[PDB]
mmCIF file of all heavy atoms in Angstrom:
data_model
loop_
_atom_site.group_PDB
_atom_site.id
_atom_site.type_symbol
_atom_site.label_atom_id
_atom_site.label_comp_id
_atom_site.label_asym_id
_atom_site.label_seq_id
_atom_site.Cartn_x
_atom_site.Cartn_y
_atom_site.Cartn_z
ATOM 1 N N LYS A 1 0.844 -1.181 0.000
ATOM 2 C CA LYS A 1 0.000 0.000 0.000
ATOM 3 C C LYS A 1 0.882 1.235 0.000
ATOM 4 O O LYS A 1 1.775 1.364 0.843
ATOM 5 C CB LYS A 1 -0.928 0.011 1.206
ATOM 6 C CG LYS A 1 -1.899 1.161 1.122
ATOM 7 C CD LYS A 1 -2.812 1.261 2.310
ATOM 8 C CE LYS A 1 -3.694 2.485 2.161
ATOM 9 N NZ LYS A 1 -4.607 2.657 3.313
ATOM 10 N N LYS A 2 0.663 2.121 -0.972
ATOM 11 C CA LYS A 2 1.549 3.256 -1.169
ATOM 12 C C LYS A 2 0.793 4.451 -1.718
ATOM 13 O O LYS A 2 -0.205 4.301 -2.428
ATOM 14 C CB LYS A 2 2.696 2.910 -2.120
ATOM 15 C CG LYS A 2 3.606 1.879 -1.534
ATOM 16 C CD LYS A 2 4.781 1.537 -2.373
ATOM 17 C CE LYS A 2 5.716 0.680 -1.549
ATOM 18 N NZ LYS A 2 7.035 0.472 -2.176
ATOM 19 N N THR A 3 1.293 5.632 -1.390
ATOM 20 C CA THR A 3 0.800 6.853 -1.988
ATOM 21 C C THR A 3 1.266 6.957 -3.434
ATOM 22 O O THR A 3 2.188 6.268 -3.872
ATOM 23 C CB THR A 3 1.298 8.066 -1.206
ATOM 24 O OG1 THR A 3 2.727 8.040 -1.143
ATOM 25 C CG2 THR A 3 0.763 8.050 0.194
ATOM 26 N N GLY A 4 0.586 7.811 -4.194
ATOM 27 C CA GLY A 4 1.227 8.367 -5.368
ATOM 28 C C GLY A 4 2.367 9.281 -4.975
ATOM 29 O O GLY A 4 3.380 9.358 -5.677
ATOM 30 N N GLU A 5 2.220 9.970 -3.838
ATOM 31 C CA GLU A 5 3.304 10.758 -3.264
ATOM 32 C C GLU A 5 4.552 9.913 -3.075
ATOM 33 O O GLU A 5 5.676 10.395 -3.253
ATOM 34 C CB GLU A 5 2.871 11.342 -1.923
ATOM 35 C CG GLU A 5 1.738 12.328 -1.978
ATOM 36 C CD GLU A 5 1.327 12.778 -0.590
ATOM 37 O OE1 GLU A 5 1.826 12.183 0.390
ATOM 38 O OE2 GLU A 5 0.510 13.717 -0.475
ATOM 39 N N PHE A 6 4.362 8.648 -2.700
ATOM 40 C CA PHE A 6 5.450 7.690 -2.633
ATOM 41 C C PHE A 6 6.244 7.792 -3.915
ATOM 42 O O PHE A 6 5.681 7.733 -5.008
ATOM 43 C CB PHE A 6 4.844 6.300 -2.465
ATOM 44 C CG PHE A 6 5.805 5.188 -2.601
ATOM 45 C CD1 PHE A 6 6.432 4.655 -1.498
ATOM 46 C CD2 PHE A 6 6.081 4.672 -3.847
ATOM 47 C CE1 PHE A 6 7.298 3.606 -1.635
ATOM 48 C CE2 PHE A 6 6.960 3.655 -3.997
ATOM 49 C CZ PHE A 6 7.576 3.111 -2.893
ATOM 50 N N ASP A 7 7.547 7.978 -3.790
ATOM 51 C CA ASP A 7 8.297 8.590 -4.878
ATOM 52 C C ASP A 7 8.817 7.480 -5.781
ATOM 53 O O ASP A 7 9.855 6.875 -5.516
ATOM 54 C CB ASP A 7 9.415 9.442 -4.297
ATOM 55 C CG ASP A 7 10.113 10.265 -5.335
ATOM 56 O OD1 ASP A 7 9.767 10.146 -6.526
ATOM 57 O OD2 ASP A 7 11.012 11.040 -4.962
ATOM 58 N N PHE A 8 8.160 7.312 -6.928
ATOM 59 C CA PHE A 8 8.233 6.043 -7.643
ATOM 60 C C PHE A 8 9.617 5.792 -8.229
ATOM 61 O O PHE A 8 10.288 4.818 -7.869
ATOM 62 C CB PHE A 8 7.165 6.025 -8.735
ATOM 63 C CG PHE A 8 5.765 6.075 -8.198
ATOM 64 C CD1 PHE A 8 4.750 6.692 -8.907
ATOM 65 C CD2 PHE A 8 5.480 5.550 -6.954
ATOM 66 C CE1 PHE A 8 3.468 6.752 -8.390
ATOM 67 C CE2 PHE A 8 4.203 5.602 -6.438
ATOM 68 C CZ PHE A 8 3.198 6.205 -7.151
ATOM 69 N N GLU A 9 10.074 6.669 -9.120
ATOM 70 C CA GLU A 9 11.348 6.414 -9.775
ATOM 71 C C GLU A 9 12.524 6.885 -8.932
ATOM 72 O O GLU A 9 13.603 6.292 -8.994
ATOM 73 C CB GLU A 9 11.383 7.063 -11.155
ATOM 74 C CG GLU A 9 12.613 6.676 -11.945
ATOM 75 C CD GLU A 9 12.618 7.260 -13.331
ATOM 76 O OE1 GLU A 9 11.669 7.996 -13.669
ATOM 77 O OE2 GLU A 9 13.576 6.988 -14.081
ATOM 78 N N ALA A 10 12.353 7.961 -8.159
ATOM 79 C CA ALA A 10 13.449 8.408 -7.305
ATOM 80 C C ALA A 10 13.849 7.309 -6.341
ATOM 81 O O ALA A 10 15.029 7.150 -6.015
ATOM 82 C CB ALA A 10 13.066 9.673 -6.544
ATOM 83 N N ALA A 11 12.875 6.532 -5.879
ATOM 84 C CA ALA A 11 13.203 5.248 -5.290
ATOM 85 C C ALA A 11 14.000 4.410 -6.274
ATOM 86 O O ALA A 11 15.148 4.051 -6.012
ATOM 87 C CB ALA A 11 11.927 4.529 -4.891
ATOM 88 N N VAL A 12 13.418 4.136 -7.443
ATOM 89 C CA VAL A 12 14.106 3.348 -8.461
ATOM 90 C C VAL A 12 15.466 3.946 -8.774
ATOM 91 O O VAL A 12 16.453 3.225 -8.948
ATOM 92 C CB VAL A 12 13.242 3.247 -9.724
ATOM 93 C CG1 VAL A 12 14.012 2.555 -10.821
ATOM 94 C CG2 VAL A 12 11.972 2.521 -9.412
ATOM 95 N N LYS A 13 15.540 5.271 -8.864
ATOM 96 C CA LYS A 13 16.833 5.912 -9.052
ATOM 97 C C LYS A 13 17.720 5.698 -7.839
ATOM 98 O O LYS A 13 18.855 5.225 -7.968
ATOM 99 C CB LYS A 13 16.636 7.394 -9.335
ATOM 100 C CG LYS A 13 15.941 7.640 -10.653
ATOM 101 C CD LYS A 13 15.614 9.097 -10.810
ATOM 102 C CE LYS A 13 14.919 9.360 -12.123
ATOM 103 N NZ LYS A 13 14.484 10.776 -12.232
ATOM 104 N N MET A 14 17.218 6.013 -6.646
ATOM 105 C CA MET A 14 17.958 5.635 -5.453
ATOM 106 C C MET A 14 18.082 4.128 -5.314
ATOM 107 O O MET A 14 18.888 3.659 -4.503
ATOM 108 C CB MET A 14 17.319 6.221 -4.192
ATOM 109 C CG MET A 14 17.380 7.715 -4.131
ATOM 110 S SD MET A 14 19.056 8.249 -4.484
ATOM 111 C CE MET A 14 19.952 7.458 -3.154
ATOM 112 N N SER A 15 17.303 3.361 -6.079
ATOM 113 C CA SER A 15 17.451 1.914 -6.121
ATOM 114 C C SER A 15 18.624 1.603 -7.031
ATOM 115 O O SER A 15 18.599 1.918 -8.223
ATOM 116 C CB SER A 15 16.179 1.233 -6.616
ATOM 117 O OG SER A 15 15.098 1.462 -5.731
ATOM 118 N N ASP A 16 19.653 0.993 -6.465
ATOM 119 C CA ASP A 16 20.847 0.660 -7.218
ATOM 120 C C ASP A 16 21.168 -0.799 -6.966
ATOM 121 O O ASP A 16 21.502 -1.179 -5.842
ATOM 122 C CB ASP A 16 22.015 1.559 -6.815
ATOM 123 C CG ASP A 16 21.819 2.993 -7.263
ATOM 124 O OD1 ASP A 16 21.018 3.231 -8.192
ATOM 125 O OD2 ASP A 16 22.448 3.888 -6.663
ATOM 126 N N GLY A 17 21.051 -1.608 -8.013
ATOM 127 C CA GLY A 17 21.292 -3.030 -7.912
ATOM 128 C C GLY A 17 20.443 -3.736 -6.874
ATOM 129 O O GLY A 17 20.912 -4.687 -6.240
ATOM 130 N N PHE A 18 19.202 -3.289 -6.677
ATOM 131 C CA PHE A 18 18.311 -3.949 -5.732
ATOM 132 C C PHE A 18 17.724 -5.195 -6.365
ATOM 133 O O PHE A 18 17.217 -5.154 -7.490
ATOM 134 C CB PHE A 18 17.159 -3.051 -5.279
ATOM 135 C CG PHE A 18 17.587 -1.829 -4.542
ATOM 136 C CD1 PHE A 18 16.643 -0.941 -4.090
ATOM 137 C CD2 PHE A 18 18.910 -1.607 -4.221
ATOM 138 C CE1 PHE A 18 17.002 0.166 -3.382
ATOM 139 C CE2 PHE A 18 19.279 -0.485 -3.530
ATOM 140 C CZ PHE A 18 18.320 0.404 -3.111
ATOM 141 N N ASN A 19 17.765 -6.297 -5.628
ATOM 142 C CA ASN A 19 17.137 -7.515 -6.093
ATOM 143 C C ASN A 19 15.626 -7.348 -5.980
ATOM 144 O O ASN A 19 15.127 -6.328 -5.501
ATOM 145 C CB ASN A 19 17.675 -8.728 -5.321
ATOM 146 C CG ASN A 19 17.316 -8.724 -3.843
ATOM 147 O OD1 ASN A 19 16.236 -8.311 -3.453
ATOM 148 N ND2 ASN A 19 18.232 -9.206 -3.015
ATOM 149 N N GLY A 20 14.891 -8.361 -6.431
ATOM 150 C CA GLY A 20 13.443 -8.300 -6.335
ATOM 151 C C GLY A 20 12.974 -8.074 -4.914
ATOM 152 O O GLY A 20 11.990 -7.371 -4.670
ATOM 153 N N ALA A 21 13.680 -8.670 -3.952
ATOM 154 C CA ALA A 21 13.367 -8.439 -2.547
ATOM 155 C C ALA A 21 13.901 -7.091 -2.091
ATOM 156 O O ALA A 21 13.199 -6.319 -1.432
ATOM 157 C CB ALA A 21 13.953 -9.563 -1.696
ATOM 158 N N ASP A 22 15.158 -6.794 -2.429
ATOM 159 C CA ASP A 22 15.708 -5.489 -2.094
ATOM 160 C C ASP A 22 14.883 -4.385 -2.730
ATOM 161 O O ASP A 22 14.811 -3.271 -2.201
ATOM 162 C CB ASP A 22 17.167 -5.406 -2.533
ATOM 163 C CG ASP A 22 18.052 -6.402 -1.803
ATOM 164 O OD1 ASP A 22 17.610 -6.975 -0.786
ATOM 165 O OD2 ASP A 22 19.194 -6.622 -2.252
ATOM 166 N N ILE A 23 14.245 -4.677 -3.859
ATOM 167 C CA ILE A 23 13.151 -3.829 -4.308
ATOM 168 C C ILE A 23 12.070 -3.757 -3.246
ATOM 169 O O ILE A 23 11.768 -2.681 -2.728
ATOM 170 C CB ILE A 23 12.602 -4.331 -5.648
ATOM 171 C CG1 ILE A 23 13.586 -3.956 -6.743
ATOM 172 C CG2 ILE A 23 11.240 -3.776 -5.881
ATOM 173 C CD1 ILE A 23 13.806 -2.480 -6.793
ATOM 174 N N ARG A 24 11.514 -4.904 -2.861
ATOM 175 C CA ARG A 24 10.477 -4.895 -1.836
ATOM 176 C C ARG A 24 10.958 -4.198 -0.583
ATOM 177 O O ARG A 24 10.152 -3.660 0.181
ATOM 178 C CB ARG A 24 10.051 -6.319 -1.506
ATOM 179 C CG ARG A 24 9.422 -6.971 -2.681
ATOM 180 C CD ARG A 24 8.960 -8.375 -2.448
ATOM 181 N NE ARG A 24 8.420 -8.919 -3.690
ATOM 182 C CZ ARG A 24 8.033 -10.178 -3.849
ATOM 183 N NH1 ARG A 24 8.128 -11.030 -2.840
ATOM 184 N NH2 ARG A 24 7.555 -10.585 -5.017
ATOM 185 N N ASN A 25 12.267 -4.195 -0.358
ATOM 186 C CA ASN A 25 12.804 -3.416 0.742
ATOM 187 C C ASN A 25 12.503 -1.936 0.555
ATOM 188 O O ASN A 25 12.168 -1.243 1.521
ATOM 189 C CB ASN A 25 14.301 -3.668 0.868
ATOM 190 C CG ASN A 25 14.612 -5.072 1.314
ATOM 191 O OD1 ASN A 25 13.760 -5.761 1.868
ATOM 192 N ND2 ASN A 25 15.845 -5.497 1.098
ATOM 193 N N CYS A 26 12.596 -1.436 -0.682
ATOM 194 C CA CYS A 26 12.132 -0.077 -0.952
ATOM 195 C C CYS A 26 10.745 0.118 -0.374
ATOM 196 O O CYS A 26 10.469 1.116 0.300
ATOM 197 C CB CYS A 26 12.094 0.202 -2.454
ATOM 198 S SG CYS A 26 13.647 0.021 -3.325
ATOM 199 N N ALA A 27 9.862 -0.841 -0.627
ATOM 200 C CA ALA A 27 8.575 -0.864 0.049
ATOM 201 C C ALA A 27 8.756 -1.098 1.538
ATOM 202 O O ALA A 27 8.312 -0.297 2.366
ATOM 203 C CB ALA A 27 7.694 -1.957 -0.555
ATOM 204 N N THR A 28 9.429 -2.191 1.893
ATOM 205 C CA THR A 28 9.326 -2.707 3.251
ATOM 206 C C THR A 28 10.217 -1.950 4.223
ATOM 207 O O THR A 28 9.797 -1.661 5.350
ATOM 208 C CB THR A 28 9.664 -4.193 3.278
ATOM 209 O OG1 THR A 28 8.828 -4.883 2.339
ATOM 210 C CG2 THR A 28 9.405 -4.750 4.669
ATOM 211 N N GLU A 29 11.453 -1.631 3.823
ATOM 212 C CA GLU A 29 12.252 -0.744 4.661
ATOM 213 C C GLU A 29 11.508 0.557 4.896
ATOM 214 O O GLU A 29 11.669 1.190 5.942
ATOM 215 C CB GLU A 29 13.619 -0.473 4.030
ATOM 216 C CG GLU A 29 14.502 -1.697 3.863
ATOM 217 C CD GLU A 29 14.766 -2.417 5.168
ATOM 218 O OE1 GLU A 29 14.902 -1.739 6.206
ATOM 219 O OE2 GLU A 29 14.850 -3.664 5.153
ATOM 220 N N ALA A 30 10.669 0.951 3.939
ATOM 221 C CA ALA A 30 9.749 2.056 4.126
ATOM 222 C C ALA A 30 8.464 1.625 4.811
ATOM 223 O O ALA A 30 7.735 2.481 5.316
ATOM 224 C CB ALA A 30 9.440 2.689 2.779
ATOM 225 N N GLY A 31 8.167 0.323 4.824
ATOM 226 C CA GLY A 31 7.114 -0.181 5.683
ATOM 227 C C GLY A 31 7.404 0.075 7.143
ATOM 228 O O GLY A 31 6.483 0.325 7.924
ATOM 229 N N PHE A 32 8.683 0.000 7.535
ATOM 230 C CA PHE A 32 9.121 0.593 8.794
ATOM 231 C C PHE A 32 8.632 2.021 8.839
ATOM 232 O O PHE A 32 7.798 2.381 9.669
ATOM 233 C CB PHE A 32 10.643 0.640 8.951
ATOM 234 C CG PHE A 32 11.303 -0.690 9.086
ATOM 235 C CD1 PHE A 32 12.679 -0.791 8.949
ATOM 236 C CD2 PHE A 32 10.579 -1.823 9.387
ATOM 237 C CE1 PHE A 32 13.321 -1.999 9.082
ATOM 238 C CE2 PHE A 32 11.214 -3.031 9.512
ATOM 239 C CZ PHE A 32 12.587 -3.125 9.365
ATOM 240 N N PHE A 33 9.166 2.844 7.938
ATOM 241 C CA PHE A 33 8.847 4.260 7.976
ATOM 242 C C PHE A 33 7.387 4.504 7.642
ATOM 243 O O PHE A 33 6.834 5.527 8.039
ATOM 244 C CB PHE A 33 9.783 5.029 7.048
ATOM 245 C CG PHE A 33 11.228 4.872 7.415
ATOM 246 C CD1 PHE A 33 12.016 3.949 6.761
ATOM 247 C CD2 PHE A 33 11.787 5.612 8.440
ATOM 248 C CE1 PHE A 33 13.335 3.777 7.103
ATOM 249 C CE2 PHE A 33 13.111 5.445 8.788
ATOM 250 C CZ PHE A 33 13.885 4.526 8.116
ATOM 251 N N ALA A 34 6.742 3.579 6.935
ATOM 252 C CA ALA A 34 5.287 3.592 6.898
ATOM 253 C C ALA A 34 4.747 3.457 8.308
ATOM 254 O O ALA A 34 4.128 4.382 8.843
ATOM 255 C CB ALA A 34 4.742 2.473 6.027
ATOM 256 N N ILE A 35 4.986 2.290 8.908
ATOM 257 C CA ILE A 35 4.730 2.085 10.327
ATOM 258 C C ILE A 35 5.248 3.252 11.149
ATOM 259 O O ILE A 35 4.591 3.691 12.099
ATOM 260 C CB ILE A 35 5.367 0.745 10.764
ATOM 261 C CG1 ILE A 35 4.475 -0.438 10.401
ATOM 262 C CG2 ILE A 35 5.839 0.762 12.205
ATOM 263 C CD1 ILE A 35 5.162 -1.740 10.642
ATOM 264 N N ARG A 36 6.412 3.792 10.788
ATOM 265 C CA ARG A 36 7.026 4.858 11.574
ATOM 266 C C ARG A 36 6.423 6.225 11.269
ATOM 267 O O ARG A 36 6.271 7.048 12.177
ATOM 268 C CB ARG A 36 8.532 4.865 11.342
ATOM 269 C CG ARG A 36 9.300 5.905 12.102
ATOM 270 C CD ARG A 36 10.765 5.710 11.806
ATOM 271 N NE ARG A 36 11.609 6.694 12.466
ATOM 272 C CZ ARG A 36 12.934 6.627 12.492
ATOM 273 N NH1 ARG A 36 13.561 5.616 11.900
ATOM 274 N NH2 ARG A 36 13.630 7.567 13.115
ATOM 275 N N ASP A 37 6.061 6.491 10.013
ATOM 276 C CA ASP A 37 5.320 7.705 9.681
ATOM 277 C C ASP A 37 3.837 7.542 9.939
ATOM 278 O O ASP A 37 3.053 8.403 9.527
ATOM 279 C CB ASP A 37 5.532 8.130 8.224
ATOM 280 C CG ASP A 37 6.920 8.671 7.967
ATOM 281 O OD1 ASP A 37 7.649 8.930 8.944
ATOM 282 O OD2 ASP A 37 7.273 8.863 6.785
ATOM 283 N N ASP A 38 3.441 6.438 10.572
ATOM 284 C CA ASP A 38 2.038 6.105 10.775
ATOM 285 C C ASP A 38 1.356 5.894 9.427
ATOM 286 O O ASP A 38 0.356 6.532 9.092
ATOM 287 C CB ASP A 38 1.335 7.183 11.603
ATOM 288 C CG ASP A 38 -0.064 6.792 11.998
ATOM 289 O OD1 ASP A 38 -0.460 5.638 11.731
ATOM 290 O OD2 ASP A 38 -0.772 7.643 12.571
ATOM 291 N N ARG A 39 1.943 5.008 8.631
ATOM 292 C CA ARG A 39 1.440 4.668 7.309
ATOM 293 C C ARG A 39 1.269 3.160 7.219
ATOM 294 O O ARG A 39 2.161 2.405 7.618
ATOM 295 C CB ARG A 39 2.404 5.139 6.224
ATOM 296 C CG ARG A 39 2.715 6.602 6.225
ATOM 297 C CD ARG A 39 1.558 7.362 5.666
ATOM 298 N NE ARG A 39 1.813 8.790 5.631
ATOM 299 C CZ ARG A 39 1.492 9.614 6.617
ATOM 300 N NH1 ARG A 39 0.904 9.138 7.706
ATOM 301 N NH2 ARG A 39 1.757 10.905 6.518
ATOM 302 N N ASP A 40 0.105 2.722 6.752
ATOM 303 C CA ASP A 40 0.050 1.462 6.026
ATOM 304 C C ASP A 40 0.434 1.685 4.572
ATOM 305 O O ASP A 40 0.977 0.792 3.909
ATOM 306 C CB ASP A 40 -1.343 0.859 6.128
ATOM 307 C CG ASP A 40 -2.408 1.798 5.616
ATOM 308 O OD1 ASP A 40 -2.087 2.982 5.371
ATOM 309 O OD2 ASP A 40 -3.558 1.350 5.432
ATOM 310 N N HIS A 41 0.156 2.885 4.072
ATOM 311 C CA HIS A 41 0.484 3.280 2.711
ATOM 312 C C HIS A 41 1.845 3.956 2.721
ATOM 313 O O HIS A 41 2.003 5.053 3.268
ATOM 314 C CB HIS A 41 -0.585 4.208 2.153
ATOM 315 C CG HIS A 41 -0.833 5.399 3.012
ATOM 316 N ND1 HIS A 41 -1.494 5.312 4.217
ATOM 317 C CD2 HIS A 41 -0.489 6.696 2.863
ATOM 318 C CE1 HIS A 41 -1.559 6.511 4.766
ATOM 319 N NE2 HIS A 41 -0.961 7.370 3.962
ATOM 320 N N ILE A 42 2.823 3.301 2.105
ATOM 321 C CA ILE A 42 4.168 3.845 2.050
ATOM 322 C C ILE A 42 4.113 5.213 1.390
ATOM 323 O O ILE A 42 3.448 5.397 0.365
ATOM 324 C CB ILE A 42 5.087 2.891 1.275
ATOM 325 C CG1 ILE A 42 4.828 1.437 1.667
ATOM 326 C CG2 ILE A 42 6.480 3.212 1.569
ATOM 327 C CD1 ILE A 42 5.020 1.118 3.070
ATOM 328 N N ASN A 43 4.810 6.172 1.965
ATOM 329 C CA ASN A 43 4.773 7.537 1.475
ATOM 330 C C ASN A 43 6.176 7.944 1.034
ATOM 331 O O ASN A 43 7.145 7.240 1.330
ATOM 332 C CB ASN A 43 4.215 8.484 2.557
ATOM 333 C CG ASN A 43 5.121 8.625 3.765
ATOM 334 O OD1 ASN A 43 6.330 8.559 3.654
ATOM 335 N ND2 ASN A 43 4.529 8.848 4.927
ATOM 336 N N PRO A 44 6.326 9.038 0.271
ATOM 337 C CA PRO A 44 7.671 9.410 -0.188
ATOM 338 C C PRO A 44 8.635 9.516 0.972
ATOM 339 O O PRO A 44 9.796 9.105 0.876
ATOM 340 C CB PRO A 44 7.458 10.774 -0.850
ATOM 341 C CG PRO A 44 6.263 11.317 -0.175
ATOM 342 C CD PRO A 44 5.376 10.141 0.066
ATOM 343 N N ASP A 45 8.139 10.066 2.081
ATOM 344 C CA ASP A 45 8.926 10.117 3.303
ATOM 345 C C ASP A 45 9.315 8.716 3.743
ATOM 346 O O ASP A 45 10.496 8.446 3.966
ATOM 347 C CB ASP A 45 8.142 10.820 4.409
ATOM 348 C CG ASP A 45 7.816 12.251 4.065
ATOM 349 O OD1 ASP A 45 8.434 12.793 3.128
ATOM 350 O OD2 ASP A 45 6.932 12.829 4.726
ATOM 351 N N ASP A 46 8.340 7.812 3.848
ATOM 352 C CA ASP A 46 8.664 6.407 4.054
ATOM 353 C C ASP A 46 9.695 5.958 3.045
ATOM 354 O O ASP A 46 10.751 5.427 3.397
ATOM 355 C CB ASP A 46 7.418 5.546 3.892
ATOM 356 C CG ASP A 46 6.347 5.930 4.830
ATOM 357 O OD1 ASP A 46 6.672 6.688 5.752
ATOM 358 O OD2 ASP A 46 5.188 5.516 4.637
ATOM 359 N N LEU A 47 9.391 6.169 1.776
ATOM 360 C CA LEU A 47 10.114 5.551 0.681
ATOM 361 C C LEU A 47 11.593 5.883 0.571
ATOM 362 O O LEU A 47 12.442 5.007 0.741
ATOM 363 C CB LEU A 47 9.440 5.924 -0.618
ATOM 364 C CG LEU A 47 10.277 5.461 -1.787
ATOM 365 C CD1 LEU A 47 10.514 3.971 -1.715
ATOM 366 C CD2 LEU A 47 9.466 5.800 -2.942
ATOM 367 N N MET A 48 11.914 7.119 0.208
ATOM 368 C CA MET A 48 13.294 7.393 -0.136
ATOM 369 C C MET A 48 14.209 7.239 1.062
ATOM 370 O O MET A 48 15.416 7.071 0.880
ATOM 371 C CB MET A 48 13.404 8.774 -0.762
ATOM 372 C CG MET A 48 12.777 8.816 -2.141
ATOM 373 S SD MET A 48 12.837 10.447 -2.886
ATOM 374 C CE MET A 48 11.538 11.250 -1.951
#
């Protein structure tokens, strides 16, 4: 679950050699910050 605000390519740009899971880490490491920003929906703040 993610915002459109969730920063799609800048993640991908900040994504460097991420595996399919390390991709999901873009989601999930931000799922922390989702959880931490009080998000079920990952937000750009969560994301990058």
Side-chain angles (χ1 to χ4, degrees):
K1 186 182 177 181
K2 294 183 170 191
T3 56
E5 296 176 351
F6 170 93
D7 188 357
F8 296 148
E9 187 177 2
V12 174
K13 294 173 180 175
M14 294 311 299
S15 297
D16 291 339
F18 297 180
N19 66 37
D22 297 346
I23 285 302
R24 296 180 183 174
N25 292 341
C26 301
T28 305
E29 297 303 324
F32 293 166
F33 301 98
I35 279 172
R36 181 177 178 171
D37 289 348
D38 188 6
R39 303 284 181 269
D40 57 349
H41 55 287
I42 317 301
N43 67 32
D45 298 344
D46 302 347
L47 172 57
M48 290 178 284

